[PDB]
Amino acid sequence: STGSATTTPIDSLDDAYITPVQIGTPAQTLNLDFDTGSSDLWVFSSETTASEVDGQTIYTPSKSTTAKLLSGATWSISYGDGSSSSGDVYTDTVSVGGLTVTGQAVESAKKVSSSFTEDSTIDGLLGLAFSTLNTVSPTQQKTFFDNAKASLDSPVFTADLGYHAPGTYNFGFIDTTAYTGSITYTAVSTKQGFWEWTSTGYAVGSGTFKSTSIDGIADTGTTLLYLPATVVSAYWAQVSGAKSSSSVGGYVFPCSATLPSFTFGVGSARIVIPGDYIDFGPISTGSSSCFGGIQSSAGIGINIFGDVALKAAFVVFNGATTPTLGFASK
Ligand SMILES: O=C(NC[C@H]1CCCO1)NC1CCCC1
Numbered sequence: 001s002t003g004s005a006t007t008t009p010i011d012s013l014d015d016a017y018i019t020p021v022q023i024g025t026p027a028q029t030l031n032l033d034f035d036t037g038s039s040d041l042w043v044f045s046s047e048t049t050a051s052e053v054d055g056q057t058i059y060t061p062s063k064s065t066t067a068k069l070l071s072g073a074t075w076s077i078s079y080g081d082g083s084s085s086s087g088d089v090y091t092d093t094v095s096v097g098g099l100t101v102t103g104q105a106v107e108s109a110k111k112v113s114s115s116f117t118e119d120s121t122i123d124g125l126l127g128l129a130f131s132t133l134n135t136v137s138p139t140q141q142k143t144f145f146d147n148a149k150a151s152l153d154s155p156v157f158t159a160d161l162g163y164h165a166p167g168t169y170n171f172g173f174i175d176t177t178a179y180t181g182s183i184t185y186t187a188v189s190t191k192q193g194f195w196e197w198t199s200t201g202y203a204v205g206s207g208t209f210k211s212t213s214i215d216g217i218a219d220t221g222t223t224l225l226y227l228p229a230t231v232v233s234a235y236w237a238q239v240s241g242a243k244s245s246s247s248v249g250g251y252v253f254p255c256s257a258t259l260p261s262f263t264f265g266v267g268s269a270r271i272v273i274p275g276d277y278i279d280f281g282p283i284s285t286g287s288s289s290c291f292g293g294i295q296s297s298a299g300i301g302i303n304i305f306g307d308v309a310l311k312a313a314f315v316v317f318n319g320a321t322t323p324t325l326g327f328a329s330k
């Protein structure tokens with residue numbers, strides 16, 4: 001089997017991407033944020049505290065003939081932005097892009113933090129990191145990918161995120177028309193439950209490539225690129241007037257600037273992030289200070305190749321017995 005779904009940016013900055021997901025029978029279509037940095041499929045629901053729902057589409061298990069309570073099971077998750085959610089669990093049929101999993105754990109939110117309530121465009125999360133991070137207790141549950149794996153033509157999924165445009169998530173096959181050149185594969189450590197890999201270095205603009213090992217995670221559910229402070233300082237030093245602002249919470253730059261590209265290594269290959277991808281626009285409406293898309297990972301404890309980086313590539317998440325990541329230009 002295979003599946004193929006279009007993923008659409010939630011707003012003009014590509015802050016996140018939503019993908020329609022069919023849950024239950026008859027189908028209830030919810031727009032979920034596919035998150036390779038977490039392992040819970042959770043949804044706004046008929047159980048979510050009414051004051052915490054503001055325009056999201058909700059899952060109503062009582063309207064699904066295939067829903068079953070996973071008796072006793074609860075979940076609770078906290079994300080690196082300080083957001084959180086928690087609730088109980090149903091099993092139901094879930095389909096993405098024509099690929100169907102029966103008996104998927106669908107984590108029904110009873111509570112969500114303010115950041116979720118305030119984002120009317122995101123109806124929940126579909127985690128695609130390793131199932132060892134799933135938060136369901138007392139019986140940990142599998143991701144949609146882990147449950148689909150054995151049925152797929154190839155044990156893979158691919159992320160092809162757009163810049164200010166829709167893109168694609170594919171399951172079970174590699175669309176050889178979706179990228180240019182060859183795919184360079186790199187080793188993954190699952191020790192922390194993430195798609196964790198080691199970049200071979202970086203370049204700023206037209207500058208020389210610095211060969212240096214940068215451990216980090218491929219995380220579709222993080223907006224920005226978070227890298228060590230040394231790398232980030234080297235990048236922003238090439239932008240007149242850029243500075244780190246403790247009041248704003250990161251690097252800002254003059255909206256009149258033209259940003260340099262940023263290159264990261266994947267083995268001997270190179271992925272180039274155009275400068276325009278690093279523009280996150282005015283810090284507040286009408287401001288001439290703009291927020292940067294490359295930020296320091298210091299204090300976060302991990303480097304994160306978020307959407308700013310991943311949208312510059314065709315990315316293969318290879319879930320074979322020995323997992324690997326692949327990157328191609330596109
Ligand atoms: O929490 C992280 N990003 C934000 C969440 C918000 C909803 C989906 O993604 N990233 C974590 C990955 C490991 C360190 C931080």
Ligand SMILES: O=C(NC[C@H]1CCCO1)NC1CCCC1
Nearest residue numbers: 015016080081221222223224300
């Ligand atoms: O990227 C992050 N969240 C993005 C999602 C949640 C709401 C908008 O889209 N959070 C990062 C902050 C520092 C590490 C994780």
